Design a protein around this ligand. Structure first.
Ligand SMILES: [Mg+2]
Ligand SMILES: [Zn+2]
Ligand SMILES: [Zn+2]
Ligand SMILES: [Zn+2]
Lengths: 49, 66, 34, 477, 240, 192, 44, 254, 115, 49
RNA sequence: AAGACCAGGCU
């Protein structure tokens, strides 16, 4: 173990990956939410190109 | 969220017509014919049912507290 | 075989298909995944 | 190019460019290059044919998709500096066909010219009928339009969340709003807008509003404020504790009522909370005790919506509180159409005082005509006419930018069939005296947005308040 | 370092001596009100309740000031503070303190800003001296500043989310100065180009043209209505 | 007060009928735009056959651009004058422009007749690509359509290339508005 | 105190200085029940 | 120098709608009548709301607002009720309010629609008008909604929930003989349903001596009051306002 | 937060006189009536009725400010006739007309219902 | 953001189809903050082996 | 407490 890397939401290594509408609703996650942002200390952070 | 009780412009009750409108649209009425059948003559009441978005159905998918 | 001025239906069908496959944030997800 | 189109050993990622005059051939597999898809044109004919459209129309339960369209060599990704060698046709039906030819070596064709717009600019109806500065203003103001931002907002604990009571999808829509999911989360209301000078309170950029409609829930909304509070330790016995103080047995002597707190020092939800009310009673044992309790933002005058108690990373007690307040649109509140016509509410008249048609229809919003001539937002008028047609027809109008199948004469001809003046004018009666108005006023439904900026969040007054420590001058903010 | 403390903008000299933050100032959004005069400004009640003006007790106004003190800070018009001749400050906002509510000549009562007060009104880009003119306070409901629309072009203001600053002079002498020097009607003609600054704008100008054409014929009741809205009218109906 | 309360009776408005002109006016405008484009084509062909004589003190490019700009400006002015003449006495655009309340004769011309030439840095639209403005046009194309002349009006709507060129035109104004303020304020402060 | 759990909606009996984990399930998120005292709304 | 002698014709009379024509009266009279139709007609609506349990996805004052917009049958007792500010009691009594109680829980799996049918009143005369049903809220399984509500008496000036009317059509001089409006192109304007001219001509010839003389009405009721009694109540209220002015002005003269 | 309550449109705050009568010194036989907590509904009615009186030389009304609920009516009459009498007569005529209209509307309703 | 040189802020021809021409912020960042077109895709890169 | 960064509004 060398460290922790923040995970982009709905990426291939996110827990929401491949989940369906029913699963996302059970998890209290909006299916319309695109992801593509990070969660750091509870806040949502978006990297600007 | 949910159909308004009153049309904002004139004040006609459109809160009891959403289910009937959905049923008519399911019964292969077009929007214009369904609105005419429900008795919404002028465009101010027609826009209510024509442009409504029912988000309450989406809100009811999430499991509730208690 | 040519689309004979049905073009307004055709182009929006292909656009629908494109946005159904990819969506809007693919550059983010693809960049992070790679 | 053949290998790239066959996807054989060259990814469609890769751009290839031949500069003939300089005799160079450049190939880029580099990352970060921006590119867009285009249709391939062979000779004068598209490679996209009717069988492709048939399969894509049956896309469901056929596992045939955009990737299968790419693999067939029909669409190709092209980046910026490969466009220098590309001959593009704006549309197939109008530049591929033989004329007194401008060009015959077309190599690519755009999918649709409206794809040059961004996310915020794709919600503008008739953007090609407006002035570009007004399009920019609308693109900027659309990010501030209030609505339902996310469906699961009741779970989220966010500061400064605004949600609208009755969002409506636009009566006049762009073909690209379906892919922006604007139907599912609309950010505005269709409203009956009359462009007239009624009483001078809509002069400049102001708006007159109908008070009866506002009383019926027109543009009503809710504001959620979130408050974070953390139990912690720092020193050997310095610690923060959630508890209900006795008012006079702590260092922070102030007038505020502590009676609303519970046993654990947290207000239960459903309790009306006003200015100075203590939402969280937290005491720090002074190595007596120091009051670090949190208060509401002044005059927020809200109601506690949700109280949550957890453990943080370290493991101390952590508390989030969400407060709601309803906000009925007032004079100072800011409203805007989809065309850059922004304005505050000059005054609100009841239904009795609003002008009315022969059918009893009264406009929800009245805007001054002087906003139109200089700003040159004709798309606003065209939207208002198309929406008037659509509300009667029962269809939703199409305001996609570059469709030649919509023009103002055709919309007028459609409107003339419903018993209305073909240009959208209508005879209005004076609300005060009942007399007819000599001029005929342009009226119709237009999509309007309520903006984040409200007068209640901007009004401020000062008289011998807090003083800065170093300069002994009044505080900033 | 000290050089950095004194050198740039927001340094001591420019940021705290040449310009500084002040008391008795208010800011909010401006909305039109064509029923006000060109020297009047609409003020919300909350701002007028917060803002105060110190007034000296004299035998003429002692009864009114006592009534204001009895009203106190709870009811809208009353006083917030009473300042004795010795400088001690009595606060009326927390408690009735009925022994302290006595007034005598020489005291200063800080009353709430009322109708008729004189205020400097400013829009921030402040490009010429007509960007800050003295107005006369009228108290109105809701929470926006209200001003006549001919006054907009001096300030270059439009009612699209614009906020304007309000400064309240705190002394009789500075009140006289603002009244005699910077009042709006005294600033109609600019010395910059010897032209009027305020004019008839927007609906009214177009209506002026349409009203002054030859074809405009007005019936009896319409004439009586239009004459009812004249303030300088002598009361004699002209022969048609 | 009195004139607002009178305007309560007559009322004022703006609408689509205020911006739609006569079919004969439309035909005149189209004919003017056609002859203007034909004239620019003739000038281009004269330069192509090296028949254009350079004005004293000015380069061949300068005089060619001057002639084309002259032709296009004359066309836009003629079309605007025709559109203004076509206006009725009831037109609300005219009622607003004549009284001087807001708007102008060029605003009426752009609304009804022709939006006009689009300029970047006081010049006609440049060649951001190698020898062309957009990938839709051919290289070395100095015609009105390729270089940013907007043939249509706001009422009729713009084609995609004209729309992009108009966005380029408005971007310059926005940038100038955003930039000039610092210099103007610094000059004002130094003078004071 | 009665604390609704954030995952399983079981209420927990719990008191001051107790470490928060739901008795049924160990979840760490709790919500306070709406108070008993009544609040009056206008239907405006 | 004296009052009109007006006459009333009634053309259409249904449970929703009343079309009638008033002849030989002033325009100001007609405008004030149509304005009183909206703002001075008393009706009964829910005004005070207390919520006990609300686990639905809509918040408390959202539900209270919807409850307030639900029409209540006001036909009988709105003359009997006092205004709360005029009632002699300190607290809600049958002479100045009507109590409603709501208690719904969704135990069943499929979603339950809480409608106006679920509102229960202490008295039978003032059921919600829709008794399809006006939808108040939708409930998932396990969600609950319990509340009490008191209804008072008011009119449209206070709030639009006390508006008895679903739009009043009003029109006079269908053929533009008085020229109160000026058509730039008369041939482009559709003809009114009250027009008395041929299909070939656009406008009636100008009448310099005429004054507006027939007023065409169309009062559409929202269901609380019958459209026939809305007009009568409006006339009585306007007469009472004028009589109150007469009384207090006689006092001021004295 | 600065919104006045809904009832100031229609309800006296206690101490206000419903009607106030002030002489106009600019012109003889002219009076100014101030009606508190009223709007166009009543002012337009009274003005229209007053314009029918042949002995009334001037009759007009206004709302000094829409955010305030106040009516001002100016009445000028001929030398031998008091504006008070003109106002009372106008009110009585309006009441008589409304009563007749009510009776005829009731008769029309009864005739419509039983055929 | 402090550079008064206008050149990098102007809407370049090569933005056609790549960057929205209408959508930019006002103030000091006009033309310096750009939004992506609907169909624009940013290349992820690959090895040129 | 303060400092820093960021985003936005009105000219
Ligand atoms: Mg502004
Ligand atoms: Zn309606
Ligand atoms: Zn649990
Ligand atoms: Zn009672």
């Amino acid at each position: 173990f060398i460290g922790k890397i923040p995970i982009m939401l709905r990426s291939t290594y996110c827990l929401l990956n491949g989940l369906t509408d029913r699963d996302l609703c059970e998890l209290n996650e909006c299916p319309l939410d695109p992801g593509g942002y990070f969660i750091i200390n509870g806040s949502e952070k978006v990297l600007i190109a | 969220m949910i159909i308004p009780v009153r049309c904002f412009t004139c004040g006609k009750i459109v809160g009891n017509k959403w289910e009937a409108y959905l049923g008519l649209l399911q019964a292969e009425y077009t929007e214009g014919d369904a609105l005419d059948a429900l008795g919404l003559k002028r465009y101010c009441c027609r826009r209510m049912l024509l442009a409504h978005v029912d988000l309450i159905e989406k809100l009811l998918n999430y499991a509730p507290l208690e | 075989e040519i689309t004979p001025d049905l073009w307004q239906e055709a182009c929006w069908i292909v656009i629908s298909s494109y946005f159904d496959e990819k969506g809007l944030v693919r550059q983010q997800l693809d960049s992070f995944d790679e | 190019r053949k290998l790239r189109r066959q996807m054989d050993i060259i990814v469609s990622e890769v751009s290839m460019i031949r500069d003939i005059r300089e005799r160079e051939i450049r190939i880029y597999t580099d990352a970060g290059r921006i590119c867009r898809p285009l249709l391939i044109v062979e000779k004068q004919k598209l490679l996209l044919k009717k069988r492709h459209i048939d399969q894509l129309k049956e896309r469901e339960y056929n596992n045939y998709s955009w990737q299968d369209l790419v693999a067939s060599g029909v669409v190709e990704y092209i980046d910026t500096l490969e466009e220098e060698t590309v001959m593009l046709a704006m549309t197939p039906d109008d530049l591929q066909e033989k004329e007194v030819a401008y060009c015959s070596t077309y190599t690519h064709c755009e999918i649709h010219p409206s794809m040059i717009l961004g996310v915020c600019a794709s919600i503008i109806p008739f953007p090609d009928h407006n002035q570009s500065p007004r399009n920019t203003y609308q693109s900027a103001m659309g990010k501030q339009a209030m609505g339902v931002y996310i469906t699961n907002f009741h779970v989220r604990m966010d500061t400064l969340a605004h949600v609208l009571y009755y969002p409506q999808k636009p009566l006049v829509t762009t073909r690209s709003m379906e892919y922006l999911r604007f139907r599912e989360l609309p950010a505005g209301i269709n409203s009956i807008v009359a462009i007239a000078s009624y009483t001078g309170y809509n002069q400049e950029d102001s708006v007159i509003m109908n008070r009866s409609a506002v009383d019926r829930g027109f543009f009503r909304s809710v504001f959620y404020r979130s408050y974070k509070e953390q139990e912690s330790k720092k020193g050997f016995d310095q610690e923060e504790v959630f508890e209900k103080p006795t008012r006079e047995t702590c260092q922070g002597m102030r007038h505020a009522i502590y009676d609303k707190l519970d046993d654990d020092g947290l207000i239960a939800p459903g309790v009306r909370v006003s200015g100075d009310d203590v939402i969280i009673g937290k005491t720090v044992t002074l190595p007596t005790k120091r009051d670090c309790s949190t208060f509401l933002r002044t005059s927020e005058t809200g109601i506690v919506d949700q109280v949550m108690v957890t453990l943080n990373q370290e493991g101390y007690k952590f508390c989030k509180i969400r407060v709601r307040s309803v906000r009925i649109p007032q004079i100072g509140d800011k409203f805007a159409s989809r065309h850059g016509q922004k304005g505050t509410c000059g005054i609100q008249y009841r239904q009795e005082d609003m002008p009315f048609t022969c059918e009893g229809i009264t406009p929800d919003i009245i805007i001054n005509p002087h906003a139109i001539p200089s700003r040159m937002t004709i798309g606003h008028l065209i939207e208002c006419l198309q929406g008037k047609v659509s509300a009667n027809k029962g269809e939703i109008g199409d305001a996609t930018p570059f469709n030649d199948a919509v023009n103002v004469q055709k919309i007028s001809n459609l409107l003339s069939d419903y018993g209305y003046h073909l240009r959208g004018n209508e005879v209005l009666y004076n609300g005060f005296t009942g007399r007819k108005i000599t001029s005929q006023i342009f009226i119709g439904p237009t999509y309007y947005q309520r903006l984040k900026h409200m007068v209640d969040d901007k009004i401020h007054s000062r008289a011998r308040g807090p003083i800065q420590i170093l300069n002994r001058q009044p505080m900033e903010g | 370092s000290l050089k950095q403390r004194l050198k740039g903008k927001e340094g001591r000299v420019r940021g705290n001596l040449m310009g500084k933050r002040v008391d008795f100032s208010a800011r909010t959004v401006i909305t039109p009100d064509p029923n006000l005069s060109i020297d009047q400004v609409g003020v919300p009640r909350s701002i007028a309740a917060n803002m105060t003006f110190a007034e000296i007790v004299t035998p003429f106004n002692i009864d009114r000031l006592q009534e204001l003190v009895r009203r106190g800070n709870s009811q809208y018009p009353g006083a917030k503070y009473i300042i004795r001749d010795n400088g001690d400050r009595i606060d009326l906002r927390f408690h009735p303190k009925p022994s302290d509510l006595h007034l005598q000549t020489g005291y200063k009562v800080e009353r709430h800003m009322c109708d008729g007060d004189i205020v400097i009104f400013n829009r921030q880009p402040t490009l010429h001296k007509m960007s800050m003119m003295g107005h006369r306070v009228r108290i109105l409901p809701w929470s926006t500043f209200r001003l006549n629309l001919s006054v907009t072009t001096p300030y270059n203001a439009d009612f699209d989310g614009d906020e304007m600053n309000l400064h309240l002079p705190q002394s009789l002498e500075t009140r006289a100065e603002i009244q005699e020097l910077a009042m709006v009607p005294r600033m109609i003609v600019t010395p910059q180009s010897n032209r009027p600054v305020m004019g008839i704008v927007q609906d009214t100008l177009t209506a002026v043209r349409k009203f002054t054409k030859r074809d405009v014929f007005l019936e009896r009741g319409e004439v009586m209505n239009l004459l009812m809205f004249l303030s300088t009218w002598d009361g004699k109906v002209p022969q048609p | 007060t009195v004139i607002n309360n009178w305007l309560l009776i007559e009322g004022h408005t703006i609408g689509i009928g205020d911006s739609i002109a006569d079919s004969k006016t439309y035909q005149d405008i189209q004919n003017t735009i056609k002859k203007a484009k034909q004239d620019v084509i003739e000038v281009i062909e004269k330069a192509h056959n090296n028949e254009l004589e350079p004005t004293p003190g000015n380069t061949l490019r300068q005089t060619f651009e001057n002639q084309v700009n002259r032709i296009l400006n004359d066309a836009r002015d003629k079309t605007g004058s025709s559109a203004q003449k076509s206006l009725s006495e009831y037109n609300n655009f005219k009622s607003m422009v004549v009284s001087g309340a807001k708007g102008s004769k060029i605003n009426i011309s752009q609304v009804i007749a022709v939006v006009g030439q689009q300029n970047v840095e006081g010049k006609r639209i440049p060649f951001g690509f190698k020898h062309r403005t957009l990938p839709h046009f051919i290289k070395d194309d100095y015609g009105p359509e390729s270089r940013g002349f907007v043939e249509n009006s706001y009422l009729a709507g713009l084609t995609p290339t004209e729309f992009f060129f108009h966005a380029m035109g408005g971007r310059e104004g926005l940038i100038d508005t955003a930039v000039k303020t610092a210099e103007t304020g610094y000059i004002q402060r130094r003078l004071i | 105190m009665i604390y609704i759990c954030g995952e399983c909606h079981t209420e927990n009996e719990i008191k001051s200085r107790d470490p928060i984990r739901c008795r049924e399930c160990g979840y760490r998120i709790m919500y306070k029940k709406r108070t008993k005292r009544l609040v009056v709304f206008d239907a405006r | 120098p004296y009052a009109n002698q007006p006459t009333v014709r009634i053309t259409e009379l249904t449970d929703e709608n009343v079309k009638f024509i008033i002849e030989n009266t002033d325009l100001a009279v007609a405008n004030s009548i149509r304005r009183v139709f909206i703002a001075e007609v008393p009706i009964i609506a829910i005004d005070w709301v207390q919520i006990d349990a609300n686990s639905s996805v809509l918040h408390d004052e959202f539900i209270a607002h919807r409850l307030g917009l639900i029409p209540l049958i006001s036909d009988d007792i709105v003359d009997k009720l006092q205004y709360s500010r005029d009632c002699t009691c300190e607290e809600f009594c049958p002479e100045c309010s009507v109590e409603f109680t709501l208690d719904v829980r969704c135990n069943e799996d499929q979603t339950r629609h809480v409608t106006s049918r679920d509102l229960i009143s202490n008295s039978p005369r003032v059921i919600p008008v829709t008794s399809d049903d006006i939808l108040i809220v939708k409930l998932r399984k396990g969600q609950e909604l319990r509340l009490r509500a008191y209804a008072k008496k008011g009119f449209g000036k206070e709030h639009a929930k006390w508006n008895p009317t679903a739009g009043v059509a009003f029109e006079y001089d269908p053929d533009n003989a008085l020229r109160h409006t000026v058509y730039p192109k008369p041939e482009e304007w559709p003809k009114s349903e009250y027009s008395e001219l041929d299909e070939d001509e656009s406008q009636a010839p100008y009448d310099p001596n005429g004054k507006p003389e027939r007023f065409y009405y169309n009062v559409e009721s929202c269901g609380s009051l019958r459209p026939e009694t809305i007009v009568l109540s409006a006339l009585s209220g306007l007469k009472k306002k004028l009589s109150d002015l007469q009384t207090q002005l006689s006092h001021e003269i004295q | 937060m600065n919104a006045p309550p809904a009832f100031e449109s229609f309800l006296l705050f206690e101490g206000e006189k419903k009607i106030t009568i002030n002489k106009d010194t600019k012109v003889p036989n002219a009076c100014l009536f101030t009606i508190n907590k009223e709007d166009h509904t009543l002012g337009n009615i009274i003005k229209s009725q007053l314009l029918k009186d042949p002995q009334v030389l001037f009759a007009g009304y206004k709302v000094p400010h829409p955010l305030e609920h106040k009516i001002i009516i100016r009445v000028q009459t001929t030398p031998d006739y008091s504006p008070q009498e003109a106002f009372t007569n106008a009110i009585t005529d309006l009441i008589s007309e409304l009563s007749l209209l009510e009776e005829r509307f009731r008769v029309a309703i009864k005739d419509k219902q039983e055929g | 953001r402090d550079g008064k040189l206008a050149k990098p802020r102007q809407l370049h021809n090569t933005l056609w189809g790549m960057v929205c021409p209408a959508e930019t912020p006002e103030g000091h960042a006009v033309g310096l903050v750009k939004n992506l077109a609907l169909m624009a895709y940013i290349s992820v890169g690959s090895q040129p082996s």
